[PDB]
């Protein structure tokens, strides 16, 4: 009569690494590393993302004609740009503090596009029909949907001075532009002034602009430039524009809402009818594992990104069915 | 093994024992069979559960973390940001892999210790009433029925009950 003491064994082929010995076959184990995604752009906690599609932040905010017009009011959980972003700044120039603006939009949860300066009846005694071939829409010459090219009317450019009082109850992003003609001839032909100036002021913003005339290399067949500026108008505050030339006046501004957990990503995937708590540019992650090796860029509630190819923790015993 | 039981003096494992990590195999006149030890198995399960759950618990939920952009005159800030992301990534990869390795070693050692202690428990319950025939087995000097085997397993082995008979057979 005998009795024996022994331990469990099975057919498991799971392997783990230890400090003394790599590659140990064990009876039970647990994977801590998430390597699977669905390859889709999904909703984040029920909220659909803001896809810009063919355009980037600059093109979307400025109002590039080639972009498919978005609904007046939008709300999202994160913003998606495509690598195929061709449509942005269509008329050559510098976008001042564009990166900072992107960083500001990174915490924005929704926008309301509204008319801050109504076209017909805002800039009397001035032309508002100016277009360009650099911003071509459907073959013809056009211009930004949110901006307005103020030009001389009937041989004169009177010193205009308009204002707007923010009663939206939220931050109002206002964008405008300053034109820099290649020669003084065009300067006189457009704004009828050689000593023109633009003045934009709020309670905390204050800037003056002076046209710089010089011949420049052709960019999109344009020797002239156009610098773009922006500011965030506080609730209850007033913004004042005063110009006697070279002002690309605002027409549509943005009522912005602040949120948490948002961000801007560059993705190739397309939007599907799914929902997730974690999103990467490669796809969505549905997991409770602490680690993931899919992508460093994550939005929502995700596992920690690591370079590891394998993170398997042994729970069972050394498997010896021999 | 650090305790020399698993893959040690108990060379192999039992596929025949499917209801537990550690246990027994018996053979008497009534027949033979396996029987997992529920106490030690449950304790080990609890401990390792606590280990896994603590490893998972220590890693907090990674909230939204996206890249940032810089113009042509901000190369320093760009490289600084990159250095931050890279450094954190290195450190976390390191920590994860190392922690997994360490806890794996400790886990195998833990199982080894459990088996060893079980064997020593049985060896201490029995005495000169049985002999060690190696491979983690004991051969009785007396007749041990299913009730006797059960007394061995649930820790109530009556040594003086069989001491006389075992003394006679041991001679």
């Amino acid at each position: 009569d005998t009795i024996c003491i022994g331990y469990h064994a099975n057919n498991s082929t799971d392997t783990v690494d230890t400090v003394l010995e790599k590659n140990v076959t064990v009876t039970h184990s647990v994977n801590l590393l998430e390597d699977s995604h669905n390859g889709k752009l999904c909703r984040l906690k029920g909220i659909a993302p803001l896809q810009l599609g063919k355009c980037n932040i600059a093109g979307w905010l400025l109002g590039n004609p080639e972009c498919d017009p978005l609904l007046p009011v939008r709300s999202w959980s994160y913003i998606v740009e495509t690598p195929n972003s061709e449509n942005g700044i269509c008329y050559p120039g510098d976008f001042i503090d564009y990166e900072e603006l992107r960083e500001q939009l990174s915490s924005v949860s929704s926008f309301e596009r509204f008319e801050i300066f109504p076209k017909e009846s805002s800039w009397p005694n001035h032309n508002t029909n100016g277009v360009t071939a650099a911003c071509s829409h459907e073959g013809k010459s056009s211009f930004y949907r949110n901006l307005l090219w103020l030009t001389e009317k009937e041989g004169s450019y009177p010193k205009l001075k308009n204002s707007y009082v923010n009663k939206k109850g939220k931050e109002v992003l206002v964008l405008w532009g300053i034109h820099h003609p290649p020669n003084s001839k065009e300067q006189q032909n457009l704004y009828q002034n050689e000593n023109a100036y633009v003045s934009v002021v709020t309670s905390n913003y204050n800037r003056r602009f002076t046209p710089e005339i010089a011949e420049r290399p052709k960019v999109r067949d344009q020797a002239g430039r156009m610098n773009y500026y922006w500011t965030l108008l506080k609730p209850g505050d007033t913004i004042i524009f005063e110009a006697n030339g070279n002002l690309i006046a605002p027409m549509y501004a943005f009522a912005l809402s602040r949120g948490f957990g948002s961000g801007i990503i560059t993705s190739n995937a397309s939007m599907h009818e799914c929902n997730t708590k974690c999103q990467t540019p490669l796809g969505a992650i549905n997991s409770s594992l602490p680690y993931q090796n899919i992508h460093p860029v994550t939005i929502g509630e995700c596992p920690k990104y690591v370079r590891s190819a394998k993170l398997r923790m042994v729970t069972g015993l050394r498997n010896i069915p021999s | 093994g650090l305790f020399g039981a698993i893959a040690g003096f108990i060379e192999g494992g039992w596929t025949g024992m499917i209801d537990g990590w550690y246990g027994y195999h018996h053979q008497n006149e009534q027949g033979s069979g396996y029987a997992a030890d529920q106490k030690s198995t449950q304790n080990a399960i609890n401990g390792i559960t606590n280990k896994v759950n603590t490893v998972i618990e220590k890693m907090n939920i990674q909230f939204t973390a996206v890249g940032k952009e810089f113009n042509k005159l901000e190369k320093r800030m760009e490289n600084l940001n990159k250095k931050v992301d890279d450094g954190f990534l290195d450190i976390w990869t390191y920590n994860a892999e190392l922690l997994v390795l360490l806890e794996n070693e400790r886990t195998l050692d833990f199982h080894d210790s459990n088996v060893k202690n079980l064997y020593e428990k049985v060896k201490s319950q029995l005495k000169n009433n049985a002999k060690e025939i190696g491979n983690g087995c004991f051969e009785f000097y007396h007749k041990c029925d299913n009730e006797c085997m059960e007394s061995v397993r649930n820790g109530t082995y009556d040594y003086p009950k069989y001491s006389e008979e075992s003394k006679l057979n041991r001679e």
Partner: peptide
Amino acid sequence: XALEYFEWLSX
């Protein structure tokens, strides 16, 4: 996490 490896474990 729970390790339901045996039926009589208590989870």
